[PDB]
Amino acid sequence: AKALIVYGSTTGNTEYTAETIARELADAGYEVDSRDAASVEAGGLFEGFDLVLLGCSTWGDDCIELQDDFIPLFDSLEETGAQGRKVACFGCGDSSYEYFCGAVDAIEEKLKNLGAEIVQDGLRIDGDPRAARDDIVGWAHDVRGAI
Ligand SMILES: Cc1cc2nc3c(=O)[nH]c(=O)nc-3n(C[C@H](O)[C@H](O)[C@H](O)COP(=O)(O)O)c2cc1C
Known part of the structure; x- marks a missing residue:
């Protein structure tokens, strides 16, 4: 596998979440390729992968903005190879805002309409993910079961 x-991460919280999911998957025997969205290229990005996890933090406060590094990829998601691809999404936000983790919904919706296969409901972390380390580890185990 x-x-x-x-991942898209401005203060490192979704990055830490991605490091935690990567270690759980690697420990299970998966080959894991982890990339910061600041430097990926959308075209053909998903091709060759059995599973693709997209992480992105929510910003905006009065409206939904995706983490700034992620916006180029999200804008190019039709070009990635998402159709038929098993995917799931994750991100950090704060439930005191009106659209809590609205970036994870936006990316899930977009993937669904592209014919991707969402294998697990998105992981939406409220607060410091270092304080939710066990729900992250749990969701990573769940996604492996869903493929
Ligand atoms: C000015 C500001 C606005 C934010 N807006 C939202 C928001 O609209 N929804 C949400 O869930 N979180 C929101 N957040 C919380 C960030 O998503 C949270 O701090 C997250 O941990 C950042 O993850 P990152 O380090 O991976 O980019 C906001 C934070 C700040 C400082």
């Missing part, structure tokens, strides 16, 4: 994890 080959997994790709692509």
Whole structure:
């Protein structure tokens, strides 16, 4: 099994979440390729991968903005190879805002309409993910079961 994890992180919280999911998948025997969205290229990005996990933090406060590094990839998601691809999404936000983790919904919706296969409901972390380390580890185990 080959997994790709692509994350957008401004203060490092979704990055830490992606490091935690990557270690759980690697420990299970998966080959994991983890990339920061600041430097990936959308075209053909998902091709070759059995599983693709997209992480992105929510910003915006009065409206939904995706983490700034992620916006180019999200804008190019039709070009990635998402149709028929098993995917799931994750991100950090704060439930005191009106659209809590609205970036994870936006990316899930977009993937669904592209004919991707969402294998697990998105992981939406409220607060410091270092304080939710066990729900992250749990969701990573769940996604492996869903493929
Ligand atoms: C000015 C500001 C606005 C934010 N807006 C939202 C929001 O609209 N929804 C949400 O869930 N979280 C929101 N957040 C919380 C960030 O998503 C949270 O701090 C997250 O941990 C950042 O993850 P990152 O380090 O991976 O980019 C906001 C934070 C700040 C400082």
